[PDB]
Amino acid sequence: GYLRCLPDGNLLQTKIHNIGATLVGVDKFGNKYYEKLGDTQYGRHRWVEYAEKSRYNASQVPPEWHGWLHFITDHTGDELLLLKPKRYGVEHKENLSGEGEQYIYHSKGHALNPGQRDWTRYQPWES
Amino acid sequence: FTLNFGSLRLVLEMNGEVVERAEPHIGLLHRGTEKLIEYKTYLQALPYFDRLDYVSTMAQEHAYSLAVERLLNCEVPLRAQYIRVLFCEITRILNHLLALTTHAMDVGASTPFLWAFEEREKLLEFYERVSGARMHASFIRPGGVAQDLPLGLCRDIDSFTQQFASRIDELEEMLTGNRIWKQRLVDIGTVTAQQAKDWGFSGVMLRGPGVCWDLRRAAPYDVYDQLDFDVPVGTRGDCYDRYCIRIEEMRQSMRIIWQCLNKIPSGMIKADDRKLCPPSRCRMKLSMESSIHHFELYTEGFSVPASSTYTAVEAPKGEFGVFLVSNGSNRPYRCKIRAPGFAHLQGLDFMSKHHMLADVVTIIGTQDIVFGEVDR
Amino acid sequence: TKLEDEQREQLAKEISKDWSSVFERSINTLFLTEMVRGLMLTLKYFFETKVTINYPFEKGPLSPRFRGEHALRRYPTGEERCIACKLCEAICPAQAITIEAEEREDGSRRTTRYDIDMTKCIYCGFCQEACPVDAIVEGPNFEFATETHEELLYDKEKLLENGDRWETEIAENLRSESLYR
Amino acid sequence: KVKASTGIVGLEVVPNAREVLIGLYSKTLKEIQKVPEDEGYRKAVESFTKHRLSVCKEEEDWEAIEKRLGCGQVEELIEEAQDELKLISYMIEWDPWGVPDDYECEVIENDAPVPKHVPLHRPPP
Amino acid sequence: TEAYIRNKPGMVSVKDMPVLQDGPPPGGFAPVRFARRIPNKGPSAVAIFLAAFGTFSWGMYQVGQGNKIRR
Amino acid sequence: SNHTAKWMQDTSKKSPMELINEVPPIKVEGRIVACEGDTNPALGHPIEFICLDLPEPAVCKYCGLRYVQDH
Amino acid sequence: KPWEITGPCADPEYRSAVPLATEYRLQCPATTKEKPCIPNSLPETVYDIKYFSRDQRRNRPPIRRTVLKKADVEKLAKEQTFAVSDFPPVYLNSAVEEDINAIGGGYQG
Amino acid sequence: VSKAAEFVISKVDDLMNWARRGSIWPMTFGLACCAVEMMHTGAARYDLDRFGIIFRPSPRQSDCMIVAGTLTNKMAPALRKVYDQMPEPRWVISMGSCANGGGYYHYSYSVVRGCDRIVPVDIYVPGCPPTAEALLYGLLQLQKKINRRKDFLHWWTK
Amino acid sequence: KVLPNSASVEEARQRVFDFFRATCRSLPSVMEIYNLYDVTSVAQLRSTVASEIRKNIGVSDPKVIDMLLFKGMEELMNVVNHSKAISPFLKNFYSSNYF
Amino acid sequence: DNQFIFKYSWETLPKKWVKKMERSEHGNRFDTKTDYLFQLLCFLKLHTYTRVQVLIDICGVDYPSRKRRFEVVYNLLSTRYNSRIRVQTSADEVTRISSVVSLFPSAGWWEREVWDMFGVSFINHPDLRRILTDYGFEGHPLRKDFPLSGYVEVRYDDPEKRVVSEPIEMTQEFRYFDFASPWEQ
Numbered sequence A: 001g002y003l004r005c006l007p008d009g010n011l012l013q014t015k016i017h018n019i020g021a022t023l024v025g026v027d028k029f030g031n032k033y034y035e036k037l038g039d040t041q042y043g044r045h046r047w048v049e050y051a052e053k054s055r056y057n058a059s060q061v062p063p064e065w066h067g068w069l070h071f072i073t074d075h076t077g078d079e080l081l082l083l084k085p086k087r088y089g090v091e092h093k094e095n096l097s098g099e100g101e102q103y104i105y106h107s108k109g110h111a112l113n114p115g116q117r118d119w120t121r122y123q124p125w126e127s
Numbered sequence B: 001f002t003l004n005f006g007s008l009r010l011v012l013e014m015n016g017e018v019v020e021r022a023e024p025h026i027g028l029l030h031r032g033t034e035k036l037i038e039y040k041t042y043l044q045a046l047p048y049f050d051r052l053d054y055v056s057t058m059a060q061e062h063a064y065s066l067a068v069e070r071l072l073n074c075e076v077p078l079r080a081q082y083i084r085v086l087f088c089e090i091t092r093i094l095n096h097l098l099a100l101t102t103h104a105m106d107v108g109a110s111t112p113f114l115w116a117f118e119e120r121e122k123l124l125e126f127y128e129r130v131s132g133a134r135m136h137a138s139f140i141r142p143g144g145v146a147q148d149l150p151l152g153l154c155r156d157i158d159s160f161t162q163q164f165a166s167r168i169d170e171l172e173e174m175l176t177g178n179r180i181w182k183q184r185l186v187d188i189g190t191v192t193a194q195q196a197k198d199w200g201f202s203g204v205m206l207r208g209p210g211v212c213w214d215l216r217r218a219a220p221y222d223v224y225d226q227l228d229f230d231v232p233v234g235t236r237g238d239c240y241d242r243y244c245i246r247i248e249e250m251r252q253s254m255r256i257i258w259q260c261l262n263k264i265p266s267g268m269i270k271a272d273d274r275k276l277c278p279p280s281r282c283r284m285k286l287s288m289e290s291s292i293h294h295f296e297l298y299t300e301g302f303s304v305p306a307s308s309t310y311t312a313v314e315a316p317k318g319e320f321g322v323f324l325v326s327n328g329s330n331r332p333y334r335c336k337i338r339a340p341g342f343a344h345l346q347g348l349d350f351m352s353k354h355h356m357l358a359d360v361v362t363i364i365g366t367q368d369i370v371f372g373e374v375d376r
Numbered sequence C: 001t002k003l004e005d006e007q008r009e010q011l012a013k014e015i016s017k018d019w020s021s022v023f024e025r026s027i028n029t030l031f032l033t034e035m036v037r038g039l040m041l042t043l044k045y046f047f048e049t050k051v052t053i054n055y056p057f058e059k060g061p062l063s064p065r066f067r068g069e070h071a072l073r074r075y076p077t078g079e080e081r082c083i084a085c086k087l088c089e090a091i092c093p094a095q096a097i098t099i100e101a102e103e104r105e106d107g108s109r110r111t112t113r114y115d116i117d118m119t120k121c122i123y124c125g126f127c128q129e130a131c132p133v134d135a136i137v138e139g140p141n142f143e144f145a146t147e148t149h150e151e152l153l154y155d156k157e158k159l160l161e162n163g164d165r166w167e168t169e170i171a172e173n174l175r176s177e178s179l180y181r
Numbered sequence D: 001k002v003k004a005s006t007g008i009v010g011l012e013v014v015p016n017a018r019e020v021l022i023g024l025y026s027k028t029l030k031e032i033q034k035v036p037e038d039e040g041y042r043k044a045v046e047s048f049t050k051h052r053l054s055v056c057k058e059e060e061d062w063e064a065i066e067k068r069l070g071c072g073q074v075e076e077l078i079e080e081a082q083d084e085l086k087l088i089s090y091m092i093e094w095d096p097w098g099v100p101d102d103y104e105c106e107v108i109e110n111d112a113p114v115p116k117h118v119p120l121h122r123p124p125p
Numbered sequence E: 001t002e003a004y005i006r007n008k009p010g011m012v013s014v015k016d017m018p019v020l021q022d023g024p025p026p027g028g029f030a031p032v033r034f035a036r037r038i039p040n041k042g043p044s045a046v047a048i049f050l051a052a053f054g055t056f057s058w059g060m061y062q063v064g065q066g067n068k069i070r071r
Numbered sequence F: 001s002n003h004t005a006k007w008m009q010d011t012s013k014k015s016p017m018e019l020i021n022e023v024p025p026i027k028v029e030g031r032i033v034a035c036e037g038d039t040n041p042a043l044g045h046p047i048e049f050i051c052l053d054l055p056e057p058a059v060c061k062y063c064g065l066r067y068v069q070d071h
Numbered sequence G: 001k002p003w004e005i006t007g008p009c010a011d012p013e014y015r016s017a018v019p020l021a022t023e024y025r026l027q028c029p030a031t032t033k034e035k036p037c038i039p040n041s042l043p044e045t046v047y048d049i050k051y052f053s054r055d056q057r058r059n060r061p062p063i064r065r066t067v068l069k070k071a072d073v074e075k076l077a078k079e080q081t082f083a084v085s086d087f088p089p090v091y092l093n094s095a096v097e098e099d100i101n102a103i104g105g106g107y108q109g
Numbered sequence H: 001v002s003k004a005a006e007f008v009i010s011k012v013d014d015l016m017n018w019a020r021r022g023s024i025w026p027m028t029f030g031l032a033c034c035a036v037e038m039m040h041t042g043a044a045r046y047d048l049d050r051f052g053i054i055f056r057p058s059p060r061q062s063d064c065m066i067v068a069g070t071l072t073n074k075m076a077p078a079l080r081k082v083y084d085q086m087p088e089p090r091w092v093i094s095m096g097s098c099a100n101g102g103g104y105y106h107y108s109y110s111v112v113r114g115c116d117r118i119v120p121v122d123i124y125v126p127g128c129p130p131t132a133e134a135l136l137y138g139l140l141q142l143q144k145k146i147n148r149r150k151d152f153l154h155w156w157t158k
Numbered sequence I: 001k002v003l004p005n006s007a008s009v010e011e012a013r014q015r016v017f018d019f020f021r022a023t024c025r026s027l028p029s030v031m032e033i034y035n036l037y038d039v040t041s042v043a044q045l046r047s048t049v050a051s052e053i054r055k056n057i058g059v060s061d062p063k064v065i066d067m068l069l070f071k072g073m074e075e076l077m078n079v080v081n082h083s084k085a086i087s088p089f090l091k092n093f094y095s096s097n098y099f
Numbered sequence J: 001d002n003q004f005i006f007k008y009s010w011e012t013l014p015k016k017w018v019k020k021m022e023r024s025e026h027g028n029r030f031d032t033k034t035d036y037l038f039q040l041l042c043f044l045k046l047h048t049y050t051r052v053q054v055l056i057d058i059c060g061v062d063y064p065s066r067k068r069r070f071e072v073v074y075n076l077l078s079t080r081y082n083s084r085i086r087v088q089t090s091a092d093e094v095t096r097i098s099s100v101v102s103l104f105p106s107a108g109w110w111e112r113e114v115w116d117m118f119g120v121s122f123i124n125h126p127d128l129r130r131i132l133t134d135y136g137f138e139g140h141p142l143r144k145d146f147p148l149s150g151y152v153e154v155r156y157d158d159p160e161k162r163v164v165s166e167p168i169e170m171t172q173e174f175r176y177f178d179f180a181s182p183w184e185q
Ligand code: SF4
Pocket: C070, C088, C091, C092, C093, C094, C095, C096, C097, C116, C120, C121, C122, C123, C124, C125, C126, C127, C128, C138
């Protein structure tokens, strides 16, 4: 995705920064994670290309690569995928929060919930 | 005529652009902090002190913990004392940087703001590595600290101290000696030592006149009596001398940080007794008594003996004091919060007398009024 | 003001000792030496490298002991890690946690209702350190801005799914910090 | 010599500091003569005022009187003397002397220890 | 128990328990130059004044020559 | 059942009760066990000692795992 | 470069603001090459637990109260006297006007 | 209503949304202790000027109000008065916990339980304080929210 | 300016009269402050103020009288600064249980 | 520490107004009558060997059990002799106590704050308007009997086009947890 650079200018900065970088990994969502040591300042030696140039979001980074990208861990996302728990767990989902009422989270008492639960803590006689 | 400005509300009486008098209205950030502290346990009330005087976070934690330990009589280990001093001086550096750069922006100088924010981002990274969050980190607790320092923090702080000596030289070169800066600062809002004592000034605003009195030397509440630092005083109290005092305080804070890094000991991070300090996770998961004490300390609190005390520390703004009155229960009966912005904002009235509007904003910047602590 | 006048005269006499000094001072005040020096420093920083983070692709450094989004974990077997000890809201300074519970079908003590207000949580980590079983943890996630307050009002199912989603990173941070405990 | 500056911005150096102090102390003694003798305030005032008057009479140089007194800043001493005059005038204006009879005062003394790391104002050397 | 938590493979007494915390490296770090060093290596006041005066004089001479050519 | 439906409404994934019933009982030789939650005692729950004289499996009451005596 | 003529840049002991990624923060906090060991108690107070001696919170003397009457007040007033050495000491301090490079040459910190 | 007029309308709406997204001019409402973190967001590291965010001190020229800090009963009328002066295309970002639901002073006199009771807020930024990273995430979320404004289509189909 | 506590009922009465004078003189300012000219009836407002003073006669402590006057002057300053047949039992019964 | 000028005061101060004294490591304490507080502070501020010339602060404590519920505390400091002192009195709701604005000019805002929080009025204050709470606040928030959440709350009323104040109707009532142990005494 290089034509998006002209109207994006931020992907342009990313592509400029991927000149001397080394592709340290890639996730199952397509995000390509790059590292670049040497003559680089501390804060800009690890980054991601989201592989979704049109509508890339900051919440698309999976938890497996979140720590490595945020400099919490030296462990890449592959090791955390290997260590992913079994018998339970859900796939990573972005922070939609506005893409639809059927997508966003609703409380059990909210009218938009598919199943709304009453809250009275007593059972009437119910003739 | 009366001119109104509207969280800083201020009404000024003007005659010829000359400020006859200035009256601030402050309650715009009142939040019932004292009432909530009375309604909550001591540990639950520590975040309130985190929020008070938010530019200087851990100074208020230090004051509150010192008051609680005074009312409680618990010995804090040397390592905990040294890390508390280190982070208090980091807090002082942060507050001085923010005060100086906001004052410079109010004057008109815009560029040092972002350099000092790069330095502040480094220091907030230090905070976030040592504790939970960059700001309002509930790290200092009665009896010690929350957790031990992560490894490498000392080396990173040393690197920061060197680069920050360079940065302070840099900022002083740009601001100090500028003709515009001098014309903005000198002979603006001068305070005599008698006036400062009458109006209850503290910290830089009190040492600016030259009273030659500092809390860290008058009542050393830490290893401060082993750190042989310097305390600058102003020859003729005004905005320029207060700014120079703040620069010198940043330098001496770096000095104290280096000394603490050099002579930090190896030991524990909190009070030895589990009746007052929570046990570790392994201890509470392995030991029956430790589980009991963790449960009791996290449902109830430590019951301080019924007494009333006033504990004051040298916060970067000035003397920050907490007046704690207890009744033997797990909650503080009364907690009065003397912030070194409440008195300075009173001093605004006579400081910005016969001055102009730009002198008023310069005086506000010099006093460095954070409205959270004045609306405590 | 007579004292001020005589002090000014004394200072003027002091800093006008000789023609060399007065000429140097006049030239310095006339040719804007300090202004030129400030301009030179400004140009140096114009030509030096920048520290901008390039937000969406490059993100600021964090720590394993980061207080981000409240979340609930599970045991490796799959059962809820949270017993209903109610130490969360006993210590929560902002009272942002509400919990109700009853005995489960197999006699286990489990919470039948567990909600946290993210508009009332002060993100202080008191619950995550008061948990006897490491059930509630303040996860590393912090980019969960919502368009609605009702969305920001969490509950047990959302906390559990957050824990399941962020289980691996939360586990890594928990190991690293249980070392520091 | 002459003091270039007193450090305190509010205070200003006075050339005739010794003469001003002598006059203020003499007036202090003359005014405190009106206070009842039984009161401890009068005894303390006479004590320190006589001591200061004696030392400032014996020593001529202000540096010498400062060094011998140990308080320093003859300007601060003059301010203290003026405040003492004001206080004596106030205690003549209102009469606080004498116990009111059938009087009780509750002296409270607790020896509860405090840790060495709390802020306690250390005594001057 | 502290001994149980910090047990050593071959320790006999509760003392000499293993310990490793953040601290100085052997040597105690390096000095950090708390003071300020501002060198004034710029041109002297007399030098810049002479340069300005000579520049003004030679420039006025050049102005005269150019005006003569234009005339 | 009722409790699970009361705190959860997804009714599509497996509830923790079903998973913990599906994990088999743990056979142990001794009469008493030490239940810690996982391989790391510091990352599990407070230690729980369980008596195994009754023939039926005994729930740990923490991370309930149903330890059963061998013979 | 024009900025080395004068100012902080001309100083040989000048430090750049930007820290290199290869020298600032070598090991991420969650992955440290060495395992920590933080003490939580003195070695003495491990197998010798005894809290009634180190109970610093409750081991305090009781508060003492004394009701002084007029006779006692007069007795103390007559007994007491003031001397030149019994007056409170003054906490005196003064400026020195000392150079910035005077303490350790400006390096030691 | 057609398929070519619909395409033209979609292009016009895309251009309008691009302009409004790239030229956001928020105004700080900086009370309490989210304003310091906001200034950190506006600093060199997480710079806001790149995305078009510049802080306009005058409410008449501002686009969206970012309320960061605690809302007090003494200050809520001022907040509402300042909000009412903003132009009709307007948005609100409630930063922190105090401005969302009262935060750490929810059970307190003279504290508004979130700015939602005074002004209609569009996006909440949870945190206390939210990291500058998170606040810039919230601003990008505002850009995404105003990236789906079919104003021209709605005007056409009335 | 705040004054010491009144030591006499006559002094308290004089202070009450002074406060009522202040209210009466400050009444026309409230007219332009609030703008309810349709049904204000300035005379009715004066009557209501007098009725409040007359319903506060059961107090006899001069300290309480002075405190009430202080709070009334505070309220006056606030208002100047513009800061705002089925029997009774059956209606409450039909409304709610808590009455 | 530094109990020098405290003992010197008790030696030199007139005994008429010293109702009680406390010698503590938490702070030396003087408790007097409200009639003589101004004179006592004038003596301390002006005397040459007890120069507490800076007023740290003025605080209020509520004691519903006592006849005079309010306790007005004055924390003062002596920088010349480097020691802190405490002088307190007892006042009730109606009685007015003397003001020390003339002695310490900083006392004005703390006295206004005490008025705001408790209701203790002062005799010689140049002004005594509320400082911290909302305009038109009715109660005194720091009194023990005052509810934590207050009596009224504000919201935006669209028909009125203004922020109106209405009686509190808050959801998620404050949950008071009784953690007190019966063996703490
Ligand atoms: S992090 Fe603090 S405020 Fe948030 S839920 Fe936990 S205890 Fe409550």
